[PDB]
Amino acid sequence: PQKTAGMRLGNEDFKKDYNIQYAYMTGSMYRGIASEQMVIKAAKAGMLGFFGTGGLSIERIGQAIGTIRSALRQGETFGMNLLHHMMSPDKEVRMIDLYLKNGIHLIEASAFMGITPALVIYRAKGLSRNHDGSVSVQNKIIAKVSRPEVAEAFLNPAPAHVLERLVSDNRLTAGEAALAKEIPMADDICVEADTLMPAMIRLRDRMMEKHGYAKKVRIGAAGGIGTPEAAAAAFLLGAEFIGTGSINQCTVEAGTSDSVKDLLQEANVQDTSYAPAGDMFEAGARVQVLKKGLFFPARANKLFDLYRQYNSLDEIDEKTKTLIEEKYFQRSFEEVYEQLKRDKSPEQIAKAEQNPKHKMAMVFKWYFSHTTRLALEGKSESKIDYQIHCGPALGAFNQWVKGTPLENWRNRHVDLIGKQLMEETAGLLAQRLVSITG
Amino acid sequence: PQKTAGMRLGNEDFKKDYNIQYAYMTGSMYRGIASEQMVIKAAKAGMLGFFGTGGLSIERIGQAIGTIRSALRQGETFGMNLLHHMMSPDKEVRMIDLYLKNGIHLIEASAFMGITPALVIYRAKGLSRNHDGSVSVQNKIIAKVSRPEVAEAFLNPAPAHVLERLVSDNRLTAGEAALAKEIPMADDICVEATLMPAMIRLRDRMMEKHGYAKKVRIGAAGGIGTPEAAAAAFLLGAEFIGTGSINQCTVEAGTSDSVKDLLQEANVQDTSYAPAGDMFEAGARVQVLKKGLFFPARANKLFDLYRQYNSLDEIDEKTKTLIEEKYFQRSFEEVYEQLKRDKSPEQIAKAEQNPKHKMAMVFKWYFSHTTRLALEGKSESKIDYQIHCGPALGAFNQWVKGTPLENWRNRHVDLIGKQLMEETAGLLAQRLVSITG
Ligand SMILES: Cc1cc2nc3c(=O)[nH]c(=O)nc-3n(C[C@H](O)[C@H](O)[C@H](O)COP(=O)(O)O)c2cc1C
Numbered sequence A: 001p002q003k004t005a006g007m008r009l010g011n012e013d014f015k016k017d018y019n020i021q022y023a024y025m026t027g028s029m030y031r032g033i034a035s036e037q038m039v040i041k042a043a044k045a046g047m048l049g050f051f052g053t054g055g056l057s058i059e060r061i062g063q064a065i066g067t068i069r070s071a072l073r074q075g076e077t078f079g080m081n082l083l084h085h086m087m088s089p090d091k092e093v094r095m096i097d098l099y100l101k102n103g104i105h106l107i108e109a110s111a112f113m114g115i116t117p118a119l120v121i122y123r124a125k126g127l128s129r130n131h132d133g134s135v136s137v138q139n140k141i142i143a144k145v146s147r148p149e150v151a152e153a154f155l156n157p158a159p160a161h162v163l164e165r166l167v168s169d170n171r172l173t174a175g176e177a178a179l180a181k182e183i184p185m186a187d188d189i190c191v192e193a194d195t196l197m198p199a200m201i202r203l204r205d206r207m208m209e210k211h212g213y214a215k216k217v218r219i220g221a222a223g224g225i226g227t228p229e230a231a232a233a234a235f236l237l238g239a240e241f242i243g244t245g246s247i248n249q250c251t252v253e254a255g256t257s258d259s260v261k262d263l264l265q266e267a268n269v270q271d272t273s274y275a276p277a278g279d280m281f282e283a284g285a286r287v288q289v290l291k292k293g294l295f296f297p298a299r300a301n302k303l304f305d306l307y308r309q310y311n312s313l314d315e316i317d318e319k320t321k322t323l324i325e326e327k328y329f330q331r332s333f334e335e336v337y338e339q340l341k342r343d344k345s346p347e348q349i350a351k352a353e354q355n356p357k358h359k360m361a362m363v364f365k366w367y368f369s370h371t372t373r374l375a376l377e378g379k380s381e382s383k384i385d386y387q388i389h390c391g392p393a394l395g396a397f398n399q400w401v402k403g404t405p406l407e408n409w410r411n412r413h414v415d416l417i418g419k420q421l422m423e424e425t426a427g428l429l430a431q432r433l434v435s436i437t438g
Numbered sequence B: 001p002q003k004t005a006g007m008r009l010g011n012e013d014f015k016k017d018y019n020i021q022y023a024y025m026t027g028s029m030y031r032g033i034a035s036e037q038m039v040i041k042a043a044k045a046g047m048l049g050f051f052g053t054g055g056l057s058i059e060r061i062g063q064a065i066g067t068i069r070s071a072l073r074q075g076e077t078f079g080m081n082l083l084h085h086m087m088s089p090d091k092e093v094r095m096i097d098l099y100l101k102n103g104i105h106l107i108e109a110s111a112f113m114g115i116t117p118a119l120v121i122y123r124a125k126g127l128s129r130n131h132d133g134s135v136s137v138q139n140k141i142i143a144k145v146s147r148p149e150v151a152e153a154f155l156n157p158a159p160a161h162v163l164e165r166l167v168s169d170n171r172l173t174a175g176e177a178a179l180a181k182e183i184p185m186a187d188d189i190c191v192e193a194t195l196m197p198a199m200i201r202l203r204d205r206m207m208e209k210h211g212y213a214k215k216v217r218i219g220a221a222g223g224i225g226t227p228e229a230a231a232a233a234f235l236l237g238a239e240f241i242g243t244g245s246i247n248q249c250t251v252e253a254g255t256s257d258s259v260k261d262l263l264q265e266a267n268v269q270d271t272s273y274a275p276a277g278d279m280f281e282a283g284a285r286v287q288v289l290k291k292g293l294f295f296p297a298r299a300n301k302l303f304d305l306y307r308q309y310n311s312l313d314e315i316d317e318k319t320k321t322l323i324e325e326k327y328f329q330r331s332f333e334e335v336y337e338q339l340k341r342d343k344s345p346e347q348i349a350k351a352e353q354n355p356k357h358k359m360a361m362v363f364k365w366y367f368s369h370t371t372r373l374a375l376e377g378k379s380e381s382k383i384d385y386q387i388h389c390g391p392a393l394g395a396f397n398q399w400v401k402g403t404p405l406e407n408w409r410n411r412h413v414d415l416i417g418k419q420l421m422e423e424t425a426g427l428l429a430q431r432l433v434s435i436t437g
């Protein structure tokens, strides 16, 4: 049907199920960096886009839904991020409720460690038996995971004790709960690898045998993909669809500042490094960020090293304490904590007043939200503090398109770079088959 | 025709130039772990083998050359490691001199940060002008590198100020130095591991810039222990590949049976990083076998102490007692005295003046000692064995689990090489057909 080589790549049922032309998804990016504009542009070009709900209010998310639906008037598929946080399980439930009320039938579920009541409610709500014997699934889930045991949890049906409970509470009907037993929690697993693939594929096959699901759950890959070569490698290793992230932040459509994008355009492969994440600061979770020309990585790492050794804010020696206040924060510890009193819940403050360790993290965490805010806002002339999440994939992309019309991010459109990546990926793949069988 | 699928992989001129059937090399492994016997077995099977000269005497290396040549009597190609050390600059020069004096026309050049006088001497010596105006290159170099700027240095001709100097000193003739201007430093770059596709563009850029007659190929090494890994490398544009870890666990490898017994049981997750002896101070790290072994933690500890204190005395008596009793089984004083016997007066002199260097020198004993423990079959305590190894071996082990190849005593370096390349070829063709169908 006039479909290009790029469109032939990856699993056919994946493309059919989501009514898309490419086995390709743009991954969520928090605080709307994966913007309404981006999701709309991706949907209209026949690929999968997810809106970045991370760290936005329910009211704001609902506003995003309305805008996207209004612009998508040919039944184009699109998705919403559902980002798990250990501390705020009610935000997730409220997000699901918003999704159910507003027609959201596709989510990217990420950072989950296992299956939650909210996910089960979403998966099972609306389930009905078709006359032809099949299960009518209203609400689809693409689970983004890095760990086999989380993948496995998603390849299994909704756990029975959660269903039983939700039926008791009249959240699900017995019929919905019965139907939920014979389908997996996720329709697709996006394996995020920022060598794991064959293990996940073997795990998938085992789970298909074990449960005898009617429809195969596909396994895709994301992480490190910014070039035709990287994408080709992912498909060789068994990816049945692929996802990108870093390259999409550096486009016209991305919901971040022009200054951020200017920085991102100049990134090379070596220009990123690891730094702690705000929302998982204590645990020691780390994420990749832009390094070249920026102080944030060193500074964020420093604050973790101080949390690590001392047990309170007072314990910090006055010379570094003066460093943090004057250079990092441009604010005193006291000033920060008082600002935090305004923002946070009384319960959280109370918890900090009793615990000097928690009070410390709480104050350092301000740096992360502050620097994120600085980045999103175009304003600061000092770019030195900008927290910018980014992997080497972008660096690779930049080198790929060096000296091209695509070099300037103002000519980079999320749907077009997506298309070109997939078409060139396809050509590269075919070209190699020519080479080795010649 | 009559070439297997495995032999078709990679760049054809790479295979032609080195008169081999596979675009495949076994990497050097120090102290003769890449043994004469291994290099011979690889050469006879139409692949590239490099002898592990690292940490051996010039006399020992010269003896290795003789043994290898005698067994290779059909003009089979083989190579020698040239391992750069910042502080043994004369060993390199003497190694080059030995290579020139003997039949060595191929080296694997590794750990170089840029181009040195010794490398230029090697490259430029044999040079002759061909009748057609082209440069006849006698002495070939495969540069193993991780950094773009080092690769670039190798993709460039011998730097002019080094040539000019060597001519002045009558090490090179003006003719040799002239010819050297129009050929690159290396014939091949083995990129040691997203860097892959980047390096290829850099190569192309350098080809355009200098218009070399022969293309410099770009290959890949690191993490390759299975058909999948090897298939991925070629798909990503590798024009040849090199392996290391999988070869240490073969009959031919020059290390102890007990080391190989440990290696046979390795899984992907059973390795970690530890500092390297020869580049201890700089903070260079290398991958080693971890599971069941104390060496990694202990080697790391010693670096943390070098990092922090500025002398041996400064170490608190409780950790000082740990190191002496458990790590070394010897006192600091006993070690230093042993070192006086071994090392050059010049090195002792430097330690006597500098307490920082004296410390490293003493900690470095641990590395040479544990390396020796591994090479020798003897110690029943395997706990201190320094064994270099990456996850590639773990992957290989899982690949051959429950097969005749499971026992390392049935693992031959040439045969696992062949099998890897043949299966790599089959995997690529079968999957590319599937994926583009
Ligand atoms: C700036 C940025 C923000 C991101 N935010 C989220 C997020 O909020 N939730 C989520 O599940 N993934 C998030 N991701 C991950 C991407 O969706 C995608 O999975 C990942 O970036 C793929 O890795 P790659 O950049 O190497 O292509 C984010 C990535 C970036 C670069």
Ligand SMILES: Cc1cc2nc3c(=O)[nH]c(=O)nc-3n(C[C@H](O)[C@H](O)[C@H](O)COP(=O)(O)O)c2cc1C
Pocket: B026, B027, B028, B029, B030, B031, B033, B052, B054, B081, B083, B110, B111, B144, B192, B221, B222, B223, B224, B225, B242, B243, B244, B245, B246, B248, B387, B388, B389, B390, B391, B392
């Ligand atoms: C035990 C061992 C010793 C090695 N010794 C050297 C060496 O002396 N000089 C060198 O350039 N590379 C040395 N290497 C690196 C290998 O030549 C090869 O490049 C590398 O192991 C390939 O990575 P892989 O193990 O993932 O296959 C050594 C590797 C191992 C495993």
